[PDB]
Write a protein that binds this DNA or RNA. Structure first.
Lengths: 154, 34, 120, 148, 255, 92, 124
RNA sequence: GUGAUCGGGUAGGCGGGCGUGCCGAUGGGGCGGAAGCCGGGCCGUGAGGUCCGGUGGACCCGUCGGUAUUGCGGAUCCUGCC
RNA sequence: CUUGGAUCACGGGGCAGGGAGUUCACCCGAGCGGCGAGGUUAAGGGGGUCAACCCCGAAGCCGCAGGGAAACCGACAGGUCC
């Protein structure tokens, strides 16, 4: 399973441990998204940065929209079905299906940038940055509901 | 016309016995290299 | 401190020529020698005849990116290319039946620089 | 060649010329004393620099002999003989006797023959003293030592 | 490089091969170093009176007068004195005659520079770029018989230069002579004068007198050559007339 | 990469045409010597076995460079004066 | 056209650009009659802290496009002219002549005549 | 060409530019009006430069290379004036 | 200056001119350049178109052999591997 992580809070007034962990996760700025695998070594880091990010399990339709809209190559170039059909024998939908069901890695697409840069959510965050999603806020683990947010921020 | 180098032997020979060695070296070099 | 290069326009021209030659022929030795010549003057290479005789063979070709000095013997004949020679070094290399030449003439005689030994 | 400009020209407008606070560049107190003041022996404001970088500066050790009696003997090596052979031949130092090449070092004005470096030619070395290593190298090159 | 030898009428007679000093590589850096050292070697030491500004007797008032703590004269006007921010006081860091102006240079570098400047005088593009008029010159380099060492009339030198083709550079030198800008006019040193050709000779037998008074023209022997004759202002490539004897003496001394 | 000839001089005592030109190169780097020879020969009807280029020079904040060329009448006259590094820099 | 576009950019930028003057130029006649920029260096200077409500400071971001930097608003670049030889050696397609202010009437008559018969724009 | 992973900054360290007076060279201007002064236009991030008009009545500038009593808002700073 | 300046903390009526990292000696480094197992002259001498220029002058200094309080003794110019 692939997890999506979005950064929500700034690193000012935060510990160097957290800052460095976020740098290692490549989450340098706010409203930036990264996709990783649900391994224990990643879950530990997510638990360490639990209070500055949201995360959850992502869906293939959402990933396809994400690649079609906010995906970039070296040079900040858009991704196109031309390029995908050339470098691989697939379309974006099939690539996403695979990626989320194993059998394929995003970096298998040559010159793919590993960070997605989103605008802030339409209608706004409907919960405080100072609290967690469970108790009515915004931070921490959602489930499939990370896709609603990715849609609002796409 | 030539420019023989003799200070190389002046700085080596024991003083009070330099002009004789210089003359012998002059003759030797003139012979060999000319 | 700002590290300038050489003030000898002939050295500057040689460095540019070496880089162009490397790009033309598809080799690395000329670019290597160029960056070695762009080395600060206080660290410029100096080699004596003894070292060449020690680490060469008969019929070898050698390039020195600095100066060659006269101290030691030469027991066999070799070709030496360098930017500056001393009188004694030139004389001692001619004796033993070798040849002392310039890096430009070496580039002429051998564009690929195959078989050449760098000493520094 | 390279004629850079002085950095006062750049610091003109800097208000302290790189010395810090406007209290920092004053008389001898700002150095800790004048000269080697405080390097030990009565005061210890620089005893730390003394023990890190300048030991054997305080105190005496040994004695000196008079130069009226000092003599500096002159020495030469086999490498030097072999590397200057042809000049020693051109000028006297090496000469000819029956079937032999001889090296008279007293002429040169040397008292000792030391033993650094190979010897190639065969020779007869005429001199007061010679070191055993030089003896062996000479007798291997095929010569003799005749001591005066 | 073979060259023709011309006569005082402007006609070639003989043929001679140039020595190897005319093949020396071009080194403007060394030429510049040597010219700058030569500059340094003719300047006079300058300093102020070491007791200037320190003739007044003063007394400071101190704390508690609504005034600053400055040393002041003790009669009627009571003006400040002796300090370097006072009017009429001493200067903080004046010029001093102890200062060293001399710059040293080594013989071998100096001679290499002279050789390079000679080789430069034997080049066309440098002579033209420097500013010399060479539209109607004969050879570049110009070599003339030893009969020129004996001409002691300025009008005969005029005619010879007309036939050789350097009178136009002499005219340029005359025309491009100006009255300076600045205070050097008070200290003499007015009439900044331009440079013309340089005649190198083996022996002087009248040519010095004959050619002296032509504006911009210098006459020098070979044994007494320097880099300021060959590269005025650090700029090499001066128009030079050589002689056969001078070139032979170059073949002998090479520098 | 365009070229405008600013000056032509003739020299009989040396036997050569001296050509001073300006190279307009905008949005492009300094042109190469082979290209400059090609264009000068295509324009002025010169023999490529002669025609050494001495220098191309660019300047601070500018898309115009300057160039100097010499066209000789004979190999004898060109070799008598021009040196070996200049003769090798070209395709000669 | 791109050159015209960059010209419009420069015009708008340099209309918006302020005239950069030192801390308090309005307050002392010693600064009113010699206006210039001096960087504020004080420990409590608000222009140094870049506070709101205060005049701004120069920076490298205010520069104009390289293509059009330094050109006369007409579109040409200027060349000072003191004599007719300098008048010659001008490309009448991209350069214009500006006659030096110390040149006399006798000589600028000639300069104008030659510019007229050469086709060179003269800004004076 | 690359820069999500370069664009705040005191003490402090480093790189490049603007300006002032003299020397060696080179190219120029000036009673058909130089320097300086007053008010204006244009270029330059800027340190500054240049042009227009007026006053003025004898010298002045650009480029290369060197030199220096070389750049002020403060010092209960110094002198003069108000 | 100060942890801290709009301060009831000090300096600050206006304008113009002046006004603050300089020189020598020794030492540690560097950016260039010359010669190179050698490098370099000082004082001074000769010539000249006479304070610029050219030619001499290696005395001395540093380096090529170090260890040792001293008497004293006195070494790889290349054997193997990465």
């Amino acid at each position: 399973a692939k997890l999506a992580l979005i950064r929500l809070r700034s690193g000012i007034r935060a510990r160097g441990e957290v800052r460095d962990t976020l740098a290692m996760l490549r989450l340098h700025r706010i409203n930036h998204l990264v996709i990783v695998d649900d391994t224990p070594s990643y879950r530990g880091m997510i638990q360490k940065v639990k209070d500055y990010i949201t995360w959850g399990e992502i869906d293939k339709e959402t990933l396809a929209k994400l690649l079609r809209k906010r995906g970039r190559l070296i040079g900040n170039k858009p991704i196109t079905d031309e390029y995908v059909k050339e470098k691989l024998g697939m379309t974006i939908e099939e690539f996403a299906e695979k990626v989320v069901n194993g059998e394929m890695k995003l970096r298998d697409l040559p010159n793919i940038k590993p960070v997605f840069r989103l605008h802030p959510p339409r209608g706004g965050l409907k919960g405080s940055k100072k609290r967690s999603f469970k108790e009515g806020g915004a931070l921490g683990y959602r489930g499939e509901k990370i896709n609603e947010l990715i849609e609002r921020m796409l | 016309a030539a420019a023989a180098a003799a200070a190389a032997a002046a700085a080596a020979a024991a003083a009070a016995a330099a002009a004789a060695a210089a003359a012998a070296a002059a003759a030797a070099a003139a012979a060999a290299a000319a | 401190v700002k590290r300038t290069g050489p003030t000898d326009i002939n050295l500057r021209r040689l460095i540019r020529t070496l880089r162009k030659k490397s790009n033309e022929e598809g080799v690395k030795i000329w670019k290597d020698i160029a960056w070695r010549l762009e080395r600060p003057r206080r660290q410029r290479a100096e080699v004596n005849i003894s070292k060449i005789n020690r680490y060469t063979k008969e019929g070898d070709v050698v390039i020195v990116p600095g100066s060659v000095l006269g101290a030691g013997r030469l027991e066999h004949k070799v070709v030496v290319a360098a930017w500056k020679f001393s009188e004694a070094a030139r004389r001692k290399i001619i004796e033993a039946g070798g040849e002392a030449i310039s890096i430009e003439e070496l580039m002429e005689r051998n564009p690929k620089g195959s078989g050449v030994i760098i000493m520094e | 060649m390279i004629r850079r400009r002085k950095k006062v020209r750049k610091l003109r407008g800097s208000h302290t010329h790189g010395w810090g606070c406007k209290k920092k560049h004053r008389g001898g107190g700002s150095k800790g004393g004048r000269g080697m003041a405080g390097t030990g022996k009565r005061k210890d404001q620089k005893w730390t620099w003394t023990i890190k970088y300048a030991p054997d500066r305080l105190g005496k050790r040994g004695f000196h002999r008079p130069k009226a009696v000092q003599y500096i003997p002159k020495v030469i090596n086999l490498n030097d003989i072999d590397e200057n052979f042809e000049l020693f031949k051109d000028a006297g130092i090496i000469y000819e006797e029956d079937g032999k090449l001889v090296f008279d070092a007293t002429a040169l004005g040397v008292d000792k023959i030391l033993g650094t470096g190979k010897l190639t030619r065969a020779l007869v070395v005429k001199a007061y003293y010679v070191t055993p290593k030089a003896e062996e190298k000479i007798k291997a090159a095929g010569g003799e030592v005749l001591l005066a | 490089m073979k060259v023709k030898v011309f006569n005082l009428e402007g006609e070639p007679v003989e043929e001679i091969e140039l020595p190897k000093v005319f093949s020396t590589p071009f080194r403007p850096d060394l030429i510049r170093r040597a010219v700058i050292a030569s500059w340094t070697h003719r300047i006079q030491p300058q300093g102020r009176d070491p007791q200037a500004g320190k003739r007044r007797v003063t007394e400071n008032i101190g704390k508690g007068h609504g005034m600053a703590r400055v040393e002041r004269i003790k009669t009627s006007p009571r003006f400040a004195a002796f300090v370097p921010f006072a009017v009429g006081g001493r200067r903080t860091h004046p010029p001093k005659v102890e200062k060293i102006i001399w710059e040293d240079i080594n013989k071998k570098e100096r001679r290499l520079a002279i050789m390079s400047a000679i080789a430069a005088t034997a080049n066309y593009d440098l002579v033209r770029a420097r500013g010399h008029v060479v539209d109607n010159v004969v050879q570049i380099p110009l070599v003339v018989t030893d009969d020129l060492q004996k001409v002691f009339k300025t009008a005969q030198t005029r005619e010879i230069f007309k036939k050789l083709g350097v009178w136009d550079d002499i005219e340029r030198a005359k025309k491009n002579t100006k009255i300076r800008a600045g205070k050097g006019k008070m200290r003499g040193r007015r009439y900044k004068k331009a440079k013309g050709p340089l005649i190198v000779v083996a022996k002087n037998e009248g040519i010095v007198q004959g050619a002296r008074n032509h504006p911009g023209v210098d006459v020098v022997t070979v044994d007494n050559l320097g880099v300021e004759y060959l590269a005025p202002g650090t700029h090499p490539g001066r128009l030079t007339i050589w002689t056969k004897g001078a070139i032979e003496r170059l073949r002998e001394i090479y520098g | 990469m365009e070229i405008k000839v600013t000056e032509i001089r003739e020299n009989k005592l040396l036997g050569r045409k001296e050509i001073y030109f300006d190279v307009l190169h905008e949005g492009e780097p300094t042109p190469s010597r082979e290209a400059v020879k090609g264009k000068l020969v295509a324009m002025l009807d010169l023999d490529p076995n002669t025609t050494v280029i001495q220098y191309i020079r660019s300047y601070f904040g500018s898309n115009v460079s300057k160039g100097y060329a010499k066209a000789y009448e004979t190999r004898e006259r060109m070799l008598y004066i021009e040196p070996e590094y200049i003769l090798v820099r070209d395709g000669l | 056209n791109e050159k015209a576009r960059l010209l419009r950019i420069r015009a708008k930028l340099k209309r918006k650009k302020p005239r950069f003057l030192r801390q308090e130029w309005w307050r002392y006649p010693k600064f009113k009659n010699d206006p210039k920029w001096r960087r504020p260096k004080g420990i409590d200077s608000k222009m140094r802290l870049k506070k709101k409500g205060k005049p701004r400071s120069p920076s490298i971001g205010w520069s104009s496009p390289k293509a059009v930097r330094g050109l006369h608003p007409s579109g040409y670049e200027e060349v000072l002219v003191h004599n007719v030889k300098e008048l010659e050696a001008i490309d009448p397609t991209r350069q214009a002549a500006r006659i030096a202010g110390t040149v006399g009437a006798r000589k600028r008559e000639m300069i104008l005549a030659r510019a007229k018969e050469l086709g060179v724009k003269v800004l004076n």
